[PDB]
RNA sequence: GUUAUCCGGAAUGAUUGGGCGUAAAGCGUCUGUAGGUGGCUUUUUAAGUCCGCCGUCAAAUCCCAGGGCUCAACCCUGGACAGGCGGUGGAAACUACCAAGCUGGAGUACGGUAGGGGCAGAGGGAAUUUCCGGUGGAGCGGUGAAAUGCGUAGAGAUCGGAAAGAACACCAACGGCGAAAGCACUCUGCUGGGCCGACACUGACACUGAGAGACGAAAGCUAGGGGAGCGAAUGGGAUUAGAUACCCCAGUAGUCCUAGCCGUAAACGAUGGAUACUAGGCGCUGUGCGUAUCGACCCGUGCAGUGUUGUAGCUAACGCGUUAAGUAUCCC
């Protein structure tokens, strides 16, 4: 790439920081409607039953979001609040569900790091 | 075989030692898969006197001190004219690790990557800033700084080499 | 006789002493004559001699050395071009660089003649930076 | 001598062309004809770059 | 604290600051338009460039220094480097310009010189197959071993007679030429290109090349010939559990030629082109000078090209190394 004419045509441009969440497309976290609350398995090295809610969003997408924590109240057609963040083990799950927010209760009996799970103080 | 190596260790006030990485490097044999320890030790007093050294042995501490005995026969002196900083900027690659060194104001502690910062904080320089361009390696990095501070000249020996009598210098 | 008459001399310098040979033969144009005139007097080289071969006046230039070493010259010469043909560079009397604090010089084309940083910093003039050596 | 180069290349293209058109498949001398056309063409842009009237005479001669 | 958005880190789009032998990456090679860069000397204008002065780039923000709120945040007063554009006065080294010379770059003229460079026309002989004769009589051919096949309608073998197409043994060399693909039986014709010398001439006419144009192994296709060998597909036999395959026997398109189309290949040196510079040894090819003889040698050399080990330097390493993957410049 000489300074003359292969480069005052253009070098090229890198695209963007590609969006790591194609939904949520305004901004960070977005209200959701539960459609399925099924349970899938990770890839080969792990072994678990991870419990994800496939959730329709208010944006216009439908997307399978993970449910953190131990206990979960989430039945059919409830309302959640999804956020970004890639669960590695599950192919397709791109998102999380916030706990302690609207119609998704905090986890049962947790006393270490409660702000990630929406549990008020005991004691 | 006199014992306990008290006089023979030479208590190392003169050269202070640190590792900069101890990677376990392993070879496989017919019987299996056995490892030795490669440690990289940078020795040097804070007077301006440092040098790297690799070593590998099946023990950790014999690899460290073995790399030290390899290191304390490999010393350059640092051309560091002013108030513990550098004469001029420099860059010198070794292998595929390029190192840009740049002198600093005296109100600046040494800021560099871990291998470069290790061989400069052992070099007793206080005021430098060296970016590393290239490898993630630690050995060729540090040895590239050593080559990057051999080839560095003061003003007195450049004034001696050119023959110009003296000016153009604040101090 | 290629595209550049200044990478001519300069690349003959680098290629001269990187093979440790202390002798250069180059053409003697006006700007080469001026560069070796402002370069012998700055302690980098030893002597420049004009002569002729087929009535074509050339410069043979003797480089510096020291004594019998691993390499008989210690300080590697490190010549470098800046204002390439096709990318001209130009500086005021502000931008004009003190190379390594002053251990190098930046030979450059003033309206006076071609100077160094000493002889263009005191003038206050600026111009096209040919090349800086260090 | 320039007009002997242009005129000499013109007779070169005449004799090589009346070779090639009655022959029609030599793909080696095609390069010779095209190097002669390009070489002559850079000469004509050269003498046109120098002069007006004199290059007008070079056009009017052939 | 998590998330989202942006910059950094990221030299991970590179002017500062990357690469293209093998890691991602050099077009298949070549001609050349636009365009880009460009030899030396002398002179002229100053468009670029530089210097002075002047105008302006609102205020707020940022920077410096003061001052005010108990400090800070914030507020306020004054100041300015950059840097942009314009006006004006100066400088002329570099780019450009104007003019005039110059030759080493490049060509041409001339004399040689080497060549499987290309195309066309003639001519050649081995060998193979088939046919036609004479002989003779049971196998020939093939394989890891067999078999299918052919053979008493006389095979194969041997001698002679024709015809046919295709390719051109030894020479053949780590060799010559072409831009690449390619090019070797010989001869002729037309014609390209290279290399070397003398100043014989012109005087920078140069390099690269977007888009473009040409050529471009083999297989493929249209049209017409031709068809011995070989031989996809196919068919039979074998091996095999099976065999659409390797083996064998037949064998069609194709192979060759005319006129086209197609435009791809590991089109490979896995290396775009050009110029300048940087150890040597051992070679080969072409010419040139001197020695030696007076003539073939033979030695050194001046160049150009081709090869092999190899210093420096580069490289992640392997390696490359005057034909660089070295040092630099230009262009895609």
Coordinates of N, CA, C and O in Angstrom, one line a residue, chain B residues 12-129:
Chain B
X12 N 24.7 -12.3 47.7 CA 24.0 -11.7 46.6 C 23.4 -10.4 47.1 O 22.2 -10.1 46.7
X13 N 24.1 -9.6 47.9 CA 23.8 -8.2 48.0 C 24.3 -7.5 46.8 O 23.7 -6.5 46.4
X14 N 25.3 -8.0 46.1 CA 25.9 -7.4 44.9 C 25.0 -7.5 43.7 O 24.8 -6.6 43.0
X15 N 24.4 -8.7 43.6 CA 23.4 -8.9 42.5 C 22.1 -9.4 43.2 O 22.1 -10.4 43.8
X16 N 21.0 -8.6 43.0 CA 19.7 -9.1 43.4 C 19.0 -9.8 42.3 O 19.3 -9.5 41.1
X17 N 18.3 -10.8 42.6 CA 17.8 -11.7 41.6 C 16.2 -11.8 41.7 O 15.6 -11.7 42.7
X18 N 15.6 -12.0 40.5 CA 14.2 -12.3 40.4 C 14.0 -13.2 39.2 O 14.7 -13.1 38.2
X19 N 13.0 -14.0 39.3 CA 12.5 -14.7 38.1 C 11.6 -13.7 37.3 O 11.3 -12.6 37.9
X20 N 11.3 -14.0 36.1 CA 10.3 -13.2 35.4 C 9.3 -14.2 34.8 O 8.1 -13.8 34.7
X21 N 9.6 -15.4 34.6 CA 8.7 -16.5 34.4 C 9.4 -17.8 34.6 O 10.6 -18.0 34.4
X22 N 8.6 -18.8 35.1 CA 9.1 -20.1 35.3 C 8.0 -21.0 34.6 O 7.0 -21.3 35.2
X23 N 8.3 -21.3 33.3 CA 7.4 -22.2 32.6 C 7.9 -23.6 32.7 O 9.1 -23.8 32.5
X24 N 7.0 -24.5 32.9 CA 7.4 -25.9 32.9 C 7.3 -26.4 31.4 O 6.3 -26.4 30.8
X25 N 8.5 -26.7 30.9 CA 8.6 -27.2 29.5 C 8.9 -28.7 29.6 O 9.6 -29.2 30.5
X26 N 8.2 -29.5 28.7 CA 8.1 -30.9 28.9 C 8.5 -31.6 27.6 O 8.2 -31.1 26.5
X27 N 9.2 -32.7 27.7 CA 9.4 -33.6 26.5 C 8.9 -34.9 26.8 O 8.7 -35.4 27.9
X28 N 8.5 -35.6 25.7 CA 8.0 -37.0 25.9 C 9.0 -38.0 25.5 O 9.9 -37.7 24.7
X29 N 9.0 -39.1 26.1 CA 9.9 -40.2 25.9 C 9.2 -41.5 25.6 O 8.0 -41.5 25.6
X30 N 9.9 -42.6 25.5 CA 9.3 -43.9 25.4 C 8.5 -44.2 26.6 O 7.4 -44.7 26.5
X31 N 9.0 -43.9 27.8 CA 8.3 -44.2 29.0 C 7.1 -43.3 29.2 O 6.2 -43.7 29.9
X32 N 7.1 -42.2 28.6 CA 6.0 -41.3 28.9 C 6.3 -39.8 28.6 O 6.6 -39.5 27.4
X33 N 6.1 -39.0 29.6 CA 5.9 -37.6 29.4 C 6.5 -36.9 30.6 O 5.8 -36.8 31.6
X34 N 7.7 -36.4 30.5 CA 8.3 -35.8 31.7 C 8.8 -34.4 31.5 O 9.1 -34.0 30.4
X35 N 8.7 -33.6 32.6 CA 8.8 -32.2 32.5 C 10.1 -31.7 33.2 O 10.5 -32.3 34.1
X36 N 10.6 -30.6 32.7 CA 11.7 -29.8 33.4 C 11.2 -28.4 33.5 O 10.1 -28.0 33.0
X37 N 11.9 -27.6 34.3 CA 11.5 -26.3 34.6 C 12.4 -25.3 33.9 O 13.6 -25.4 34.2
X38 N 11.9 -24.5 33.0 CA 12.6 -23.4 32.4 C 12.3 -22.1 33.2 O 11.1 -21.7 33.1
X39 N 13.2 -21.6 33.8 CA 13.1 -20.3 34.5 C 14.0 -19.3 33.9 O 15.0 -19.6 33.4
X40 N 13.5 -18.0 33.8 CA 14.2 -16.9 33.3 C 14.5 -16.0 34.4 O 13.6 -15.4 35.0
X41 N 15.8 -15.8 34.7 CA 16.2 -15.0 35.8 C 16.9 -13.7 35.3 O 17.8 -13.9 34.4
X42 N 16.5 -12.6 35.8 CA 17.2 -11.3 35.4 C 18.0 -10.9 36.6 O 17.4 -10.5 37.7
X43 N 19.3 -10.8 36.5 CA 20.1 -10.4 37.6 C 20.6 -9.0 37.3 O 20.6 -8.5 36.2
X44 N 21.0 -8.3 38.4 CA 21.5 -7.0 38.2 C 21.4 -6.2 39.5 O 20.5 -6.3 40.3
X45 N 22.4 -5.4 39.7 CA 22.4 -4.4 40.8 C 21.6 -3.2 40.3 O 21.5 -3.0 39.1
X46 N 21.2 -2.3 41.2 CA 20.5 -1.1 40.8 C 21.6 0.0 40.4 O 21.2 1.1 40.1
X47 N 22.8 -0.4 40.3 CA 23.8 0.6 39.8 C 23.7 0.8 38.3 O 24.2 1.9 37.8
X48 N 23.1 -0.1 37.6 CA 23.1 0.1 36.1 C 23.7 -1.2 35.5 O 24.5 -1.1 34.5
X49 N 23.4 -2.3 36.0 CA 24.2 -3.6 35.7 C 23.2 -4.7 35.7 O 22.8 -5.2 36.8
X50 N 22.8 -5.2 34.6 CA 21.8 -6.3 34.5 C 22.1 -7.3 33.3 O 22.9 -7.0 32.5
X51 N 21.4 -8.4 33.4 CA 21.5 -9.4 32.3 C 20.5 -10.5 32.5 O 20.3 -10.9 33.7
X52 N 20.0 -11.1 31.4 CA 19.0 -12.2 31.5 C 19.8 -13.5 31.6 O 21.0 -13.5 31.5
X53 N 19.0 -14.6 31.9 CA 19.6 -15.9 31.7 C 18.5 -16.9 31.8 O 17.6 -16.9 32.7
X54 N 18.5 -17.9 30.9 CA 17.5 -19.0 31.0 C 18.2 -20.1 31.7 O 19.4 -20.2 31.8
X55 N 17.3 -21.0 32.2 CA 17.8 -22.3 32.7 C 16.7 -23.3 32.7 O 15.5 -22.9 32.7
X56 N 17.0 -24.6 32.7 CA 16.0 -25.6 32.9 C 16.6 -26.8 33.6 O 17.7 -27.2 33.3
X57 N 15.9 -27.3 34.6 CA 16.3 -28.4 35.4 C 15.0 -29.0 36.0 O 14.0 -28.4 36.1
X58 N 15.2 -30.3 36.4 CA 14.0 -30.9 37.0 C 13.5 -30.4 38.3 O 12.4 -30.5 38.7
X59 N 14.4 -29.7 39.0 CA 14.1 -29.0 40.2 C 13.8 -27.5 39.9 O 14.3 -27.0 38.9
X60 N 13.0 -26.9 40.7 CA 12.7 -25.5 40.5 C 13.8 -24.6 40.9 O 14.3 -23.7 40.1
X61 N 14.4 -24.8 42.0 CA 15.4 -23.9 42.6 C 16.7 -24.0 41.9 O 17.4 -23.0 41.7
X62 N 17.0 -25.2 41.5 CA 18.3 -25.4 40.7 C 18.1 -24.8 39.3 O 19.2 -24.5 38.7
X63 N 16.9 -24.8 38.8 CA 16.7 -24.1 37.5 C 16.8 -22.6 37.7 O 17.4 -21.9 36.8
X64 N 16.3 -22.1 38.8 CA 16.4 -20.6 39.0 C 17.9 -20.2 39.2 O 18.4 -19.3 38.5
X65 N 18.6 -20.9 40.1 CA 20.0 -20.5 40.4 C 20.9 -20.9 39.3 O 21.9 -20.3 39.0
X66 N 20.5 -21.9 38.5 CA 21.3 -22.3 37.3 C 21.2 -21.3 36.2 O 22.2 -20.9 35.6
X67 N 20.0 -20.7 36.1 CA 19.8 -19.6 35.2 C 20.5 -18.3 35.7 O 20.8 -17.4 35.0
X68 N 20.6 -18.3 37.1 CA 21.3 -17.1 37.6 C 22.8 -17.2 37.3 O 23.4 -16.1 37.0
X69 N 23.4 -18.4 37.4 CA 24.8 -18.5 37.1 C 25.1 -18.3 35.6 O 26.1 -17.8 35.2
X70 N 24.1 -18.7 34.8 CA 24.1 -18.3 33.4 C 24.0 -16.8 33.2 O 24.5 -16.2 32.3
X71 N 23.2 -16.2 34.1 CA 22.9 -14.8 34.0 C 24.1 -13.9 34.5 O 24.4 -12.9 33.8
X72 N 24.7 -14.3 35.6 CA 25.8 -13.4 36.1 C 27.1 -13.6 35.5 O 28.1 -13.1 36.0
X73 N 27.2 -14.3 34.3 CA 28.3 -14.2 33.4 C 27.8 -13.4 32.1 O 28.6 -13.4 31.1
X74 N 26.6 -12.8 32.1 CA 26.1 -12.1 31.0 C 25.6 -10.8 31.5 O 24.4 -10.6 31.9
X75 N 26.5 -9.8 31.5 CA 26.2 -8.5 32.0 C 26.6 -7.4 31.0 O 27.7 -7.4 30.4
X76 N 25.7 -6.5 30.8 CA 26.1 -5.2 30.2 C 25.8 -4.1 31.3 O 25.1 -4.3 32.3
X77 N 26.5 -3.0 31.1 CA 26.2 -1.8 31.9 C 25.3 -0.8 31.1 O 25.4 -0.8 29.9
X78 N 24.5 -0.2 31.8 CA 23.4 0.7 31.2 C 24.0 2.1 31.0 O 24.4 2.7 32.0
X79 N 24.0 2.6 29.8 CA 24.2 4.0 29.6 C 23.1 4.8 30.1 O 22.1 5.0 29.5
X80 N 23.2 5.5 31.3 CA 22.2 6.2 32.0 C 22.7 7.5 32.6 O 23.2 7.5 33.7
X81 N 22.7 8.5 31.7 CA 23.5 9.7 32.0 C 23.0 10.6 33.1 O 23.6 10.8 34.2
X82 N 21.7 11.0 33.0 CA 21.1 12.0 33.8 C 20.7 11.5 35.1 O 21.2 10.5 35.6
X83 N 19.7 12.2 35.7 CA 19.1 11.8 36.9 C 18.3 10.4 36.8 O 17.1 10.4 37.0
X84 N 19.0 9.4 36.6 CA 18.5 8.0 36.5 C 17.5 7.9 35.4 O 16.3 7.5 35.6
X85 N 17.9 8.2 34.2 CA 17.0 8.0 33.0 C 17.9 7.8 31.8 O 19.1 7.4 31.9
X86 N 17.4 8.0 30.6 CA 18.0 7.6 29.4 C 18.5 8.7 28.5 O 18.0 9.8 28.6
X87 N 19.6 8.5 27.8 CA 20.1 9.5 26.9 C 19.2 9.9 25.8 O 19.0 11.1 25.5
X88 N 18.6 8.9 25.1 CA 17.8 9.2 23.9 C 16.9 8.0 23.7 O 17.1 7.0 24.3
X89 N 15.9 8.2 22.8 CA 15.1 7.1 22.6 C 15.7 6.0 21.7 O 16.7 6.3 21.0
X90 N 15.2 4.8 21.7 CA 15.9 3.7 21.1 C 14.8 2.7 20.7 O 13.8 2.6 21.4
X91 N 15.1 1.9 19.7 CA 14.3 0.8 19.4 C 15.2 -0.3 18.8 O 16.0 0.0 17.9
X92 N 15.0 -1.6 19.2 CA 15.8 -2.6 18.7 C 15.1 -3.9 18.9 O 14.7 -4.3 20.0
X93 N 14.9 -4.7 17.8 CA 14.2 -5.9 17.8 C 15.2 -7.1 18.0 O 16.4 -7.0 17.7
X94 N 14.7 -8.2 18.6 CA 15.5 -9.4 18.6 C 14.5 -10.5 18.4 O 13.5 -10.7 19.1
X95 N 14.8 -11.3 17.3 CA 13.8 -12.3 16.9 C 12.6 -11.6 16.3 O 12.7 -11.0 15.3
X96 N 11.5 -11.7 17.0 CA 10.3 -11.1 16.6 C 9.7 -10.3 17.8 O 8.4 -10.3 17.9
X97 N 10.5 -9.8 18.7 CA 10.0 -8.9 19.7 C 10.7 -7.6 19.5 O 11.9 -7.5 19.6
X98 N 9.9 -6.5 19.2 CA 10.4 -5.2 19.1 C 10.2 -4.4 20.3 O 9.1 -4.6 21.0
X99 N 11.1 -3.6 20.7 CA 11.0 -2.8 22.0 C 11.3 -1.4 21.7 O 12.5 -1.1 21.4
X100 N 10.4 -0.5 21.9 CA 10.6 0.9 21.9 C 10.9 1.4 23.3 O 10.0 1.4 24.1
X101 N 12.1 1.9 23.6 CA 12.4 2.6 24.8 C 12.4 4.1 24.6 O 12.9 4.6 23.5
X102 N 12.0 4.9 25.6 CA 11.9 6.3 25.5 C 12.3 6.9 26.8 O 11.8 6.4 27.8
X103 N 13.2 7.9 26.9 CA 13.5 8.5 28.1 C 12.3 9.4 28.7 O 11.5 9.8 27.9
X104 N 12.4 9.6 30.0 CA 11.3 10.2 30.6 C 11.7 11.3 31.5 O 12.9 11.4 31.9
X105 N 10.8 12.2 31.9 CA 11.0 13.1 33.0 C 11.2 12.4 34.3 O 10.9 11.3 34.5
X106 N 11.9 13.1 35.3 CA 12.2 12.4 36.5 C 11.0 12.2 37.4 O 11.0 11.3 38.3
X107 N 9.9 12.9 37.1 CA 8.7 12.5 37.8 C 7.9 11.5 37.1 O 6.7 11.8 36.7
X108 N 8.4 10.3 36.8 CA 7.8 9.2 36.1 C 8.5 7.9 36.5 O 9.6 7.7 36.1
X109 N 7.8 7.1 37.3 CA 8.3 5.8 37.5 C 8.3 4.9 36.2 O 7.6 5.3 35.3
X110 N 9.0 3.9 36.2 CA 9.2 3.1 35.0 C 7.9 2.4 34.6 O 7.3 1.8 35.4
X111 N 7.5 2.7 33.4 CA 6.3 2.1 32.9 C 6.6 1.3 31.6 O 7.0 1.9 30.6
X112 N 6.5 0.0 31.7 CA 6.7 -0.9 30.6 C 6.0 -2.2 30.8 O 5.4 -2.4 31.9
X113 N 6.1 -3.1 29.9 CA 5.6 -4.4 30.1 C 6.5 -5.3 31.0 O 7.6 -4.9 31.1
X114 N 5.9 -6.3 31.5 CA 6.5 -7.1 32.6 C 7.9 -7.5 32.5 O 8.7 -7.4 33.4
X115 N 8.3 -8.0 31.3 CA 9.7 -8.3 31.1 C 10.6 -7.1 31.0 O 11.7 -7.1 31.6
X116 N 10.2 -6.1 30.2 CA 10.9 -4.9 30.0 C 11.0 -4.2 31.4 O 12.1 -3.7 31.7
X117 N 9.9 -4.0 32.1 CA 9.9 -3.4 33.4 C 10.7 -4.2 34.4 O 11.3 -3.6 35.3
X118 N 10.8 -5.5 34.2 CA 11.6 -6.3 35.1 C 13.1 -6.0 34.9 O 13.9 -5.8 35.8
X119 N 13.5 -6.0 33.6 CA 15.0 -5.7 33.4 C 15.3 -4.2 33.5 O 16.5 -3.9 33.5
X120 N 14.3 -3.3 33.7 CA 14.7 -1.9 33.9 C 14.6 -1.6 35.4 O 15.5 -0.9 35.9
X121 N 13.6 -2.2 36.1 CA 13.6 -2.0 37.6 C 14.8 -2.7 38.2 O 15.1 -2.3 39.3
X122 N 15.3 -3.7 37.6 CA 16.6 -4.2 38.1 C 17.8 -3.4 37.5 O 18.9 -3.5 38.1
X123 N 17.6 -2.6 36.5 CA 18.7 -1.8 36.0 C 18.9 -0.6 36.7 O 19.8 0.2 36.4
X124 N 18.1 -0.2 37.7 CA 18.2 1.0 38.4 C 17.8 2.2 37.8 O 17.9 3.3 38.4
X125 N 17.4 2.2 36.5 CA 16.8 3.3 35.9 C 15.5 3.6 36.6 O 14.8 2.6 37.0
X126 N 15.1 4.8 36.7 CA 13.9 5.2 37.4 C 12.9 5.8 36.5 O 11.7 5.9 36.8
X127 N 13.3 6.4 35.4 CA 12.5 7.3 34.6 C 12.6 6.9 33.2 O 13.4 7.4 32.4
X128 N 11.8 5.9 32.8 CA 11.8 5.5 31.4 C 10.3 5.2 31.0 O 9.5 5.1 31.9
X129 N 10.1 5.0 29.8 CA 8.8 4.4 29.3 C 9.1 3.7 28.1 O 9.6 4.2 27.1

